[PDB]
Structures are given as structure tokens and as C-alpha cells.
Amino acid sequence: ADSQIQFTRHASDVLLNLNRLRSRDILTDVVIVVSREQFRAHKTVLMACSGLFYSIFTDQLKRNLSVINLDPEINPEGFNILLDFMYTSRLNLREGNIMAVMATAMYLQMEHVVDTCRKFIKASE
Amino acid sequence: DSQIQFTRHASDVLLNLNRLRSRDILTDVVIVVSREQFRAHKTVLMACSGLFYSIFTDQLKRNLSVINLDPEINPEGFNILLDFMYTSRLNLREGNIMAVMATAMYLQMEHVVDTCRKFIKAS
């Protein structure tokens, strides 16, 4: 007799603990620079969520890199919202920043998030 | 002001972390359990285990790329828990369950030990 126990909130408990680690700056191994603002994070999480960061950290000449800059035209807010989303499953929006968020996700190669924003636009009002 | 809640996001993130694991990408440590070795990500181990939380929290054994456990810790029991860590699924056979609880106790995985207890009370 073989059996399997499926922990339905496990992935969520793991993601919460990873966010906690981020907030306490524990085991964080990279800083992302957007304009003059910095954001500490874990490459593995960034890679798991962004096709772009996946490439960057897959790139032998930019893998052991401890810092990463982005297009200077990428506003920090939109990016911060995406980073939070990555670590919480929650995408906090305002009618005033959804476009910047959608634009930023597309840049980060997060197509599913771009498409969800579209679905959101579609249902708004 | 709105908030879109991605109900399977955590699970998709966890799967992608297991993919990295299997493709040995960004893995940054090796857990040795007797002759057998296991490559993994420290953050994942920390998220799930108090022991590992304390180990990689220890400024000393914080940067080591290899950690050794008591040799009486059977690899199968450990591997089942490691899998669980990266997939949310715990595979149990009537013959290795007790071993698993015993192993999780070592790794400081109280909830998993308690779930197993709850399991035996029915099976």
C-alpha cells in the first residue's frame, strides 16, 4: 500500500517564507537597479518568474554578477509591483499605474501577467 | 486600487524551482546523508526546515557548499522529504512512514510529523 499526502497550501507557505527571507535580506544574492533605486532579491525567484531574469542568470558572463541594471526608462514603481507579485502572488494596481505595470511585465518577459492585465482591462467598469 | 490574486502562482513558482533543481541550476549546496548526496537550493531548504534555517543562518556554516547529517539518517526518508519540499507532495509507503516522521523530526518539520500522526490514526 502506497499513499501520497498533498499539502494544498505548501507552495504558498514556501513563497511566504521566501518573501520573509527577502524582507530580512537573508540569503539574497543580487540587487536590481532601476533608475537610482535598488531592490534586493533571490535570483532563483527572479528566474522562476521572469523569462528575462532567466536569460540574464543563464548567461555565463552575467551569472555570477551581483548587480543588474535595467532600461533607465523602466519606472521603479511598476517594477516594485511586479517584484512583490513574484514573492506574494498578488499584483497591486491603481488605474494610474496599470499601463506602466503591463509595460514593465512585458519587458521582464512575464507574458501571463501581461495577458491577465488585458483580461482585467476587459472587465473593468 | 485593485489587487489581482493569482491562485496558482505559488505552485507555478515552486514547480519552476524544482525544474532548476533537476537541471542543477543555481543549486548552491549539497546535503550528504551517508554515501548519498543531494543538490538543492539553500533558500528552499530554509523555507521548509528549521534545521536548515539555523544552519544557513549560522555565519560560520552559512557559506559552505556541503552539509553532512547524522549517518543514521536514512537517505530514502530524507529524499521523500526533499521531494515534498519542492513539490508539496509527500510519498509514503506503509514501511517507510515511521522512518519519515523520525527524519522530519530531525529536520524540524513539525507540521509534516503531525500530519503523519493524523494519518496513522485512520490508516
Binding site: 528566474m47 522562476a48 518568474c49 521572469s50 523569462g51 532567466y54 502572488s89 497591486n92 518577459q109 512575464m110 507574458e111 501571463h112 501577467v113 491577465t116 483580461k119 482585467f120 472587465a123 | 486600487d1 485593485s2 489587487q3 489581482i4 490574486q5 493569482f6 491562485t7 496558482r8 502562482h9 507555478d12 513558482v13 514547480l15 519552476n16 525544474r19 532548476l20 533537476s22 537541471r23
Partner: peptide
């Protein structure tokens, strides 16, 4: 300020990293 409206997204949230 405002009371946040929430809605759920059930689909895949990010790319799927291949085996």
C-alpha cells in the same frame, strides 16, 4: 485612500521552465 477591489486569476502566472 480606498478599499481594494480584488479579483482572482486562475491561470498560469508565469512561464513554465522546461525539464
Amino acid at each position: 485612500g480606498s478599499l481594494v477591489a480584488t479579483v482572482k486569476e486562475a491561470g498560469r502566472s508565469i512561464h513554465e521552465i522546461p525539464r
